[PDB]
Amino acid sequence: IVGGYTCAANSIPYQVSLNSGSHFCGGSLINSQWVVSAAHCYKSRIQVRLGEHNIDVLEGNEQFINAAKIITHPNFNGNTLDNDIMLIKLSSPATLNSRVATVSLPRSCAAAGTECLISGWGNTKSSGSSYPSLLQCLKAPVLSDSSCKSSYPGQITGNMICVGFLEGGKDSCQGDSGGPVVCNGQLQGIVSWGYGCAQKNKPGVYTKVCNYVNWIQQTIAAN
Numbered sequence: 220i221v222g223g224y225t226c227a228a229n230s231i232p233y234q235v236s237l238n239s240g241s242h243f244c245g246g247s248l249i250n251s252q253w254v255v256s257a258a259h260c261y262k263s264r265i266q267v268r269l270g271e272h273n274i275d276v277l278e279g280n281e282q283f284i285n286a287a288k289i290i291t292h293p294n295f296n297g298n299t300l301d302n303d304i305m306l307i308k309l310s311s312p313a314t315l316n317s318r319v320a321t322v323s324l325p326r327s328c329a330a331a332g333t334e335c336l337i338s339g340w341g342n343t344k345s346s347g348s349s350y351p352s353l354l355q356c357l358k359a360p361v362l363s364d365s366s367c368k369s370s371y372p373g374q375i376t377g378n379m380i381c382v383g384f385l386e387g388g389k390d391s392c393q394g395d396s397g398g399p400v401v402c403n404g405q406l407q408g409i410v411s412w413g414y415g416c417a418q419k420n421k422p423g424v425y426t427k428v429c430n431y432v433n434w435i436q437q438t439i440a441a442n
């Protein structure tokens with residue numbers, strides 16, 4: 220997260236860290252046994268770290284649970300990044316408490332201008348590279364489909380939203396991928412792509428979660 224702030228410890232209780240020896244992507248806990256993330260994050264083996272604030276220290280609220288099943292959207296396209304979404308089934312259910320909690324899936328898509336909360340342990344620098352210990356947060360609005368499409372001509376599908384700023388300086392980044400965009404209590408976005416990070420007229424592009432509730436619920440029910 221570039222241009223953010225340090226979240227209050229455990230204030231984003233649905234945020235997970237996906238770990239394969241080190242943190243590599245975020246995710247969101249959307250059922251006691253399921254995390255949703257980005258398909259471009261795929262690895263064949265994943266440990267899900269719930270309840271984290273400092274990913275570099277064991278502070279006691281953490282639950283470390285291995286992925287039992289990893290399911291990428293069948294129509295994920297690695298070129299266009301359309302359908303950039305993945306589900307992870309935990310090997311045992313997460314235990315839900317104040318520090319580890321599910322986030323609602325969307326009841327509707329979000330209006331342009333809706334304020335959202337973006338979070339992750341990704342890069343915090345717009346030049347160079349710094350990876351934080353502590354979870355980072357960013358408040359940012361849903362942009363119009365128009366403002367999104369003018370920024371990325373021909374590249375925004377109906378399954379993508381832009382969330383962020385046109386001025387630059389405030390965006391998600393590498394290592395935030397897969398993580399949450401939560402707007403009015405609902406998971407509306409998954410960190411997916413953009414051109415660099417926090418550049419002028421290159422807002423973050425996010426998987427449009429409100430188009431995937433049937434895919435998520437159908438995949439959960441089968442497994």
Ligand SMILES: N=C(N)c1ccc(CO)cc1
Binds near residue numbers: 412417422
């Ligand atoms: N600018 C962004 N929001 C952004 C986020 C994530 C990624 C993942 O490489 C690229 C860009």
Ligand SMILES: [Ca+2]
Binds near residue numbers: 275277279281
């Ligand atoms: Ca920790």
Ligand SMILES: [Mg+2]
Binds near residue numbers: 275350351352
């Ligand atoms: Mg580090």
